[PDB]
Amino acid sequence: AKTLGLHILADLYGVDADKIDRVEDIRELLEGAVKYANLTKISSHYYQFQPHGATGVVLLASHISIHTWPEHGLATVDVYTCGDPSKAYRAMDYIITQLNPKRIDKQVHERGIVEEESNQ
Amino acid sequence: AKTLGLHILADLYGVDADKIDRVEDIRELLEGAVKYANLTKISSHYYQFQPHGATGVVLLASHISIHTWPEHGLATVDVYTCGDPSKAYRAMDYIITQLNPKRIDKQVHERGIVEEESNQ
Ligand SMILES: [Ca+2]
Ligand SMILES: [Ca+2]
Ligand SMILES: [Mg+2]
Ligand SMILES: [Mg+2]
């Protein structure tokens, strides 16, 4: 049995408000993750919330997402890729180092388990 | 302490291939979830994979996502909302009933824990 994808989600705390308050920040961040992880993008969409904070989602060829709350020094991140687990890990390592959080809560899930042998 | 958001993820198995093979299907499905759950959408993006299967992501005003594999009767779903947990549950209940999977693996996460009292 093999997993079709690896999904890493993390809640990052103690993140400087200036690193996650505008779309520009999230965009640079996720563009940087994608390239560092050598992932291929289908498209990317961002949204600026008032008075600050933003959402960013990247559809991969699964997805990478980030929602932020400057007032709480918090960013919730998702890195879900299919096939190459090392890319999911690299993307998350990049995002975390760039945001440099003080505390983290992380979890990993193998999404979709399928047989390698079929019944003949 | 309160949670800023509720994130439900589920891997649905035994799903008829015809219910998850084209974008049209995912679009109808997610549009239906959003309305049934009374969620407000910012935008929505879909992608058609060859020879079939699709990705769908909806940015909420967090997000709802779905990736599918017709050949495996599989769909991986994410319903992440902020503030109203009952909406996340309704959205996932809708998606599941529409797809009517035979087997399910689900998990719920409270994303982002913040204090209700501050230190004076
Ligand atoms: Ca981008
Ligand atoms: Ca829609
Ligand atoms: Mg900034
Ligand atoms: Mg169909």
Curated annotation (Swiss-Prot), chains A, B:
Family to which the UniProt record says this protein belongs: Belongs to the prokaryotic AdoMetDC family. Type 1 subfamily.
Species in which this protein is naturally found: Aquifex aeolicus (strain VF5)
Cofactor(s) needed for function: pyruvate
SUPFAM superfamilies: S-adenosylmethionine decarboxylase (SSF56276)
Modified residues (Pyruvic acid (Ser)): 62
Protein's name according to its UniProt entry: S-adenosylmethionine decarboxylase proenzyme
Database matches in HAMAP family: AdoMetDC_1 (MF_00464)
InterPro entries: AdoMetDC_fam_prok, S-AdoMet_deCO2ase_core, S-AdoMet_deCOase_pro-enz
Catalytic activity: S-adenosyl-L-methionine + H(+) = S-adenosyl 3-(methylsulfanyl)propylamine + CO2
EC identifiers of the protein: 4.1.1.50
One protein family per Pfam: AdoMet_dc
UniProt-listed Gene3D superfamilies: S-adenosylmethionine decarboxylase
Record flagged with keyword S-adenosyl-L-methionine: yes
Annotated keywords: Autocatalytic cleavage, Decarboxylase, Lyase, Polyamine biosynthesis, Pyruvate, S-adenosyl-L-methionine, Schiff base, Spermidine biosynthesis, Zymogen
Binding note for cofactor: Binds 1 pyruvoyl group covalently per subunit.
GO MF annotation terms: adenosylmethionine decarboxylase activity
